[PDB]
Design an enzyme around this catalytic site. Structure first.
Site, PDB file in Angstrom:
ATOM      1  N   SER A  23      48.548  40.991  39.077  1.00 57.59           N
ATOM      2  CA  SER A  23      46.992  40.603  39.126  1.00 57.59           C
ATOM      3  C   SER A  23      46.770  40.364  40.480  1.00 57.59           C
ATOM      4  O   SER A  23      47.069  39.035  40.711  1.00 57.59           O
ATOM      5  N   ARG A  24      45.843  41.153  41.135  1.00 58.68           N
ATOM      6  CA  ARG A  24      45.729  40.638  42.567  1.00 58.68           C
ATOM      7  C   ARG A  24      44.288  39.838  42.720  1.00 58.68           C
ATOM      8  O   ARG A  24      43.862  39.739  43.946  1.00 58.68           O
ATOM      9  N   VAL A  25      44.143  39.341  41.527  1.00 55.60           N
ATOM     10  CA  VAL A  25      42.936  38.267  41.271  1.00 55.60           C
ATOM     11  C   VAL A  25      43.274  37.128  41.997  1.00 55.60           C
ATOM     12  O   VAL A  25      42.609  36.151  42.379  1.00 55.60           O
ATOM     13  N   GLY A  26      44.838  36.942  41.919  1.00 59.08           N
ATOM     14  CA  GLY A  26      45.418  35.499  42.485  1.00 59.08           C
ATOM     15  C   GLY A  26      45.001  34.382  41.886  1.00 59.08           C
ATOM     16  O   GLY A  26      44.038  34.315  40.800  1.00 59.08           O
ATOM     17  N   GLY A  44      45.179  44.399  40.846  1.00 55.73           N
ATOM     18  CA  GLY A  44      45.780  44.172  39.716  1.00 55.73           C
ATOM     19  C   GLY A  44      45.961  45.376  38.769  1.00 55.73           C
ATOM     20  O   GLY A  44      44.947  46.316  39.015  1.00 55.73           O
TER      21      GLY A  44
END
Lengths: 505, 187, 469
Positions: A372-375, A348
């Site tokens: 945001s690659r926190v998903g 992210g």
């Protein structure tokens, strides 16, 4: 023919005069030629690699180049202080900085000297500046909440504890404020008794005016929050080698908290100034210029720094230490070596648009270039449910406005009406952190399209009034979102009903 | 630092040697021993000229030193430490270079001018002497400095004579006068 | 054997040793320097004379006391391979770092190995399909092939690869290797967890997967020989077990990058940009040890973290040389919101042809390319003067092209977490039919938004009903 360090005539003279200088060169050295903030020392043969040495100037240095017959120390200190043929004594220890619990509410410099001067630092131990990242096996998935109080950054960017998440944007938009707001928002989290509900937030100030930081410190103490937060400082005044060692040292302090299993957070503001520092150091070490004149091991530096922030495994006590490195994008162009390198490392990024900032949102979160690659999941389930599809909606507003500049189909117009109205709701002024309970209904309203009942001018009125209305009408609903943290079908219906009720008036 | 500064590169060894043995005041001894090892270099021409070539090991280089000091024990002691240095630094090409440099530096410390009277012909000894006398008479020799004067034959000097010593020369040549003639009689 | 040395220098993790004994380890030998913290494995890379080698150190140098005893462990580092490497996540050394305990090593094999010969090549052509429409139409894969991906890594780049693992490796029966150089530890933990969950790795019983993980924290030198280590494991499967393998590399830009750093330290004057002079040879050797040989054809997926999307930086350029298919992924197209974020004029496979995949497929693709190329061509013209003020014939084309772009948008299975949209894998035969129709404007009677983020033609139709509501 060739030039060897022993050819230095005084050294050469000792060898001729019999031999050497009586094994004094194994644990003390005497400085040779010096300048460029690096010194070349003769002796110190028992020097450990990356040891801390103390020069008699008081300046301490980290051995960098261990070469046959000479060592090239890097001076953590100013040149004037150091002088040739000075006696360097081994600290005997790899570079370590005091770490412990009693740094909460302390401003220190990179050597751990309390520059708040609130006495000596109460530090349990000292721990080596570089420490390896936790592997795959000691890693564990994130699920803890980090609520920033900024709805966009807490409904389009889900943040949880132990993560690595970039905050990127344009120069002197008072870049700091987004992070400051997070620290404030988790005041009541940090007023939470549970220490897995306490964060210990570290603000690493690299390359910032010593004055500005001091204003920030006073601001923090006005906003009564200094006591749960640490400040590490490597100001503009502070020497480039000190700046280089500043983030690494800060992360060690955080790791003591992390390695208690206790949840923490660390904000590294600004690594872009670390890049310039490492550039300076490298160039003065005559290491060949990398691309954009930034060294080739800059990737290695950043990756080593960033990957020491983690959500440890259950064995290690779920050691959170969230990382938020703050990158000052060169002209807002994310194509640029230092920004791209960070983007690939982080999960992210939160790019901010100047145009939106200028166009009166402070903060103004561009959502085209914020990901945001926190998903899914890392924030409250209520705020997963209500937040559903809003990312799509504001990238439908984005799509709509892509082609807005001829004739409009009713579908696009409806979206434009939603989009504009949603945009007003998004807008937030600095130092207005919003509770989780409060964020749920607002997002409910817009998502369920009950915000078409409000015109753009009256959106602000609606927001404040709606929140007051909800509490007065039934703070029971909000209490349910406060404890349950979820909307039951009844609660959801009650909220739909409540939203409709306020919307009507 | 000890008199006469030499900015020799690998002559820094000679300079060092000089000041080191000057401070141990064993410079005459050094010079003599240096002459003796220099002589044993000339008197070792096969593999003492033809193995001044860099191909020696550390261990093999050391053993070359050991063979040389077997040949004579007339060594300064400081130059035995210097021999060690030269083996370790694998200084061997500028080995006679260092010898020459110390010799010049030493005999400068002793005082001794050098000189040459390059000419287009090998001048008389009467000329050598008359010129040497003249040079000593001239305030150029102020004493504490002696003289070497070698007239050499060089076809390159066309016209006049050239006296050289103390970086002070009088250069009589035809060429400069020819030059002025040429330039003006073409312009 | 005990062949002593001392550590003369420690200029980075490019230690220089002086083997006191004239018995000098040969180049590509391995050395063990004993330390209180484990040991260090170093690899001789130069002989600098006077029995002073300069050695790459595959571990992070610190603490070193100047002049440290060495012992020669000889030859190229020999990793341990086996069926008991399946399941394992292995260190560069080969140490099982997932702590499923020591590998019962059958064969321990040298890290360095030579690529099979020209005559030994067995050149394949067997179509591998993913079910990703854009991939199928524009650059269909081939099993045993060399697949390539470019652009910003972990911009969902990692996710794209993960989708490939989800699709292709849950359709591959043979072994499969995931090797992630400079892998993001959390993503790796997730992947390992997912693999264990999907039985692909099953802690009890066999795993048809083996894993190599190299974190970007690990010093450059370690990262340099992560690739070679994985490549050896691959050779064991390819050769010794014989079986066809999948392979994932993520990212090999990290391999190149690491090399440029060490090259400078080695003393090699840095070539353009900064890259190692030996960049071409090393990349070449490595990518020809993943080649299609009579003993096995290994399907490779190569992931390049193109730095600032400078394909003109020689390492991405030279990657194209060692590829048969590429799927350059464009940040711009990502900005356009398309997932898959694949550049559509910068994907290629040699498998795309008018007989290899048939004339009808080729014609459909040809038309898509031409249509899109026109649309891109008129982007200036459209903007300065509206498409209304451009030709009517073209205006149909432009409207069509906008639809086509959106049609290419297809949700994905493990993108479902991030996107929140249930994935779609559509049959290749179905894809050709679907795009053909759209090109013939059969379904160009319904919204452009209908085509966006959906699978098959039928789904578009159904979504038209949805939009209508």
């Amino acid at each position: 023919t060739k030039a060897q360090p022993t050819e230095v005539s005084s050294i050469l003279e000792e060898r001729i005069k019999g031999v050497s200088d009586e094994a004094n060169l194994n644990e003390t050295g005497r400085v040779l030629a010096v300048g460029d903030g690096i010194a070349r020392v003769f002796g110190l043969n028992n020097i450990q690699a990356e040891e801390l040495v103390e020069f008699s100037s008081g300046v301490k240095g980290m051995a960098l180049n261990l070469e046959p017959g000479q060592v090239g120390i890097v001076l953590f200190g100013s040149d004037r202080l150091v002088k040739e043929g000075e006696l360097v004594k081994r600290t005997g220890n790899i570079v370590d900085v005091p770490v412990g619990p009693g740094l909460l509410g302390r401003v220190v410099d990179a050597l751990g000297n309390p520059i708040d001067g609130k006495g000596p630092i109460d530090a349990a131990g000292r721990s080596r500046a570089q420490v390896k990242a936790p592997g795959i096996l000691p890693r564990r998935s994130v699920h803890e909440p980090v609520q920033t109080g900024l709805k966009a950054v807490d409904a389009l960017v889900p943040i949880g504890r132990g993560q690595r998440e970039l905050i990127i944007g344009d120069r002197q938009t008072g870049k700091t404020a987004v992070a400051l707001d997070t620290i404030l928002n988790q005041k009541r989290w940090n007023n939470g008794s549970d220490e897995s509900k306490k964060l210990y937030c570290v603000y690493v100030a690299v390359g910032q005016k010593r004055s500005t930081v001091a204003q920030l410190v006073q601001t923090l103490e006005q906003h009564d929050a200094m006591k749960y937060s640490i400040i590490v400082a490597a100001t503009a005044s502070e020497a480039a080698p000190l700046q280089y060692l500043a983030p690494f040292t800060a992360a060690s302090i955080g790791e003591w908290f992390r390695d208690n299993g206790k949840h923490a957070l660390i904000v590294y503001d600004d690594l872009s100034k670390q890049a310039v520092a490492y550039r300076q150091l490298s160039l003065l070490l005559r290491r060949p210029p990398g691309r954009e004149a930034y060294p080739g091991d800059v990737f290695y530096l950043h990756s080593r720094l960033l990957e020491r922030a983690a959500k440890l495994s259950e064995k290690e006590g779920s050691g959170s230490l969230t990382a938020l490195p703050v990158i000052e994008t060169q002209g807002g162009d994310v194509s640029a070596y230092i920004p791209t390198n960070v983007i690939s490392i982080t999960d992210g990024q939160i790019f901010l648009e100047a145009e939106l900032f200028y166009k009166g949102i402070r903060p103004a979160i561009n959502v085209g270039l914020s990901v945001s690659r926190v998903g899914s999941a890392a924030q409250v389930k209520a705020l997963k449910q209500v937040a559903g599809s809003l990312k799509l909606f504001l990238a439908q507003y984005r799509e709509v406005a892509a082609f807005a500049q001829s004739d409009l189909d009713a579908s696009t117009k409806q979206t434009l009406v939603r989009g504009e109205r949603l945009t007003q709701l998004l807008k937030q002024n600095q130092y207005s952190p919003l509770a989780t309970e409060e964020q749920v209904p607002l997002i409910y309203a817009g998502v369920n399209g009950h915000l078409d009942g409000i015109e753009l001018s009256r959106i602000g009125e609606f927001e404040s009034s709606f929140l007051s209305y909800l509490k007065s009408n039934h703070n029971e609903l909000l209490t349910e979102i406060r404890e349950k943290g979820e909307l039951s079908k009844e609660l959801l219906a009650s909220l739909k009903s409540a939203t409709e009720s306020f919307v009507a008036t | 630092p000890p008199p006469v500064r030499l900015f020799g590169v690998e002559g820094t060894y000679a300079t060092a040697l000089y000041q080191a043995a000057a401070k141990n005041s064993s410079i005459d001894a050094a010079f003599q021993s240096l002459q003796k090892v220099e002589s044993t270099v000339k008197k070792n021409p096969k593999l003492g000229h033809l193995l001044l070539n860099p191909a020696l090991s550390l261990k093999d280089r050391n053993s070359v030193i050991d063979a040389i000091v077997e040949t004579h024990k007339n060594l300064d002691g400081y130059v035995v430490n210097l021999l060690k240095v030269l083996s370790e630094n694998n200084r061997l090409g500028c080995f006679e270079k260092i010898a020459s440099d110390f010799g010049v530096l030493n005999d400068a410390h002793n005082g001794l001018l050098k000189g040459t009277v390059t000419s287009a012909e090998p001048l008389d000894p009467k000329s050598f002497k008359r010129i040497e006398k003249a040079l000593s008479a001239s305030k150029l020799v102020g004493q504490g400095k002696s003289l070497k004067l070698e007239n050499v034959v060089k076809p390159e000097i066309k016209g006049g004579l050239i006296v050289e010593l103390g970086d002070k020369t009088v250069d009589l040549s035809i060429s400069t006068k020819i030059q002025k003639l040429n330039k003006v009689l073409e312009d | 054997t005990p062949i002593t040395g001392k550590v003369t220098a420690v200029i980075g993790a490019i230690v220089d040793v002086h083997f006191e004994q004239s018995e000098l380890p040969a180049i590509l030998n391995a050395l063990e320097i004993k330390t209180p913290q484990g040991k260090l494995v170093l690899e001789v890379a130069q002989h600098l004379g006077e029995n002073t080698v300069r050695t790459i150190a595959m571990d992070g140098t610190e603490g070193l006391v100047r002049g440290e005893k060495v012992l020669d462990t000889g030859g190229p580092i020999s990793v341990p391979v086996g069926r008991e490497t399946l399941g394992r996540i292995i260190n560069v050394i080969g140490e099982p770092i997932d702590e499923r305990g020591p590998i019962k090593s059958k064969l321990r094999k040298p890290i360095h190995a030579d690529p099979p010969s020209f005559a030994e090549q067995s050149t394949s052509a067997e179509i591998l399909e993913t079910g990703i429409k854009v991939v199928d139409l524009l650059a269909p894969y081939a099993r045993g092939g060399k697949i390539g991906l470019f652009g910003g890594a972990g911009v969902g780049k990692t996710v794209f690869i993960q989708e490939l693992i989800n699709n292709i490796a849950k359709a591959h029966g043979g072994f499969s290797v995931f090797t992630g150089v400079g892998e993001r530890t959390r993503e790796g933990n997730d992947l390992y967890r997912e693999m264990k969950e999907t039985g692909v790795i099953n802690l009890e019983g066999e795993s048809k997967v083996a894993l190599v993980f190299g974190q970007m924290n690990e010093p450059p030198g370690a990262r340099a020989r992560v690739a070679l280590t994985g490549l050896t494991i691959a050779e064991y499967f390819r050769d010794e077990e014989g079986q066809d393998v999948l392979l994932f590399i993520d990212n090999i830009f990290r391999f190149t990058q690491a090399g440029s750093e060490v090259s400078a330290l080695l003393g090699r004057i840095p070539s353009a940009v900064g890259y190692q002079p030996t960049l071409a040879t090393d990349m070449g050797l490595l990518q020809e040890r993943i080649t299609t040989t009579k003993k096995g054809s290994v399907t490779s997926v190569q992931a390049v973290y193109v730095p600032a999307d400078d394909l003109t930086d020689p390492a991405p350029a030279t990657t194209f040389a060692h590829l048969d298919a590429t799927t350059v992924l464009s940040r711009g197209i990502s900005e356009l919101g398309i997932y898959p974020a694949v550049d559509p004029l910068d994907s290629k496979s040699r498998l795309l042809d008018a007989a290899v995949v048939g004339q009808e497929h080729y014609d459909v693709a040809s038309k898509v390319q031409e249509t899109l190329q026109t649309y891109k061509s008129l982007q200036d013209i459209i903007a300065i003067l509206g498409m209304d003020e451009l030709s009517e014939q073209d205006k149909l084309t432009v409207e069509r092209a906008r639809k086509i772009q959106r049609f290419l948008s297809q949700p994905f299975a493990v993108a479902e977490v991030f996107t929140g949209i249930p994935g779609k894998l559509v049959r290749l035969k179905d894809t050709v039919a679907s795009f053909k129709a759209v090109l013939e404007g059969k379904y160009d009677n319904i919204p452009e938004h209908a085509f966006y983020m959906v699978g098959g033609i039928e789904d578009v139709v159904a979504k038209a009903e949805k939009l209508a509501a």
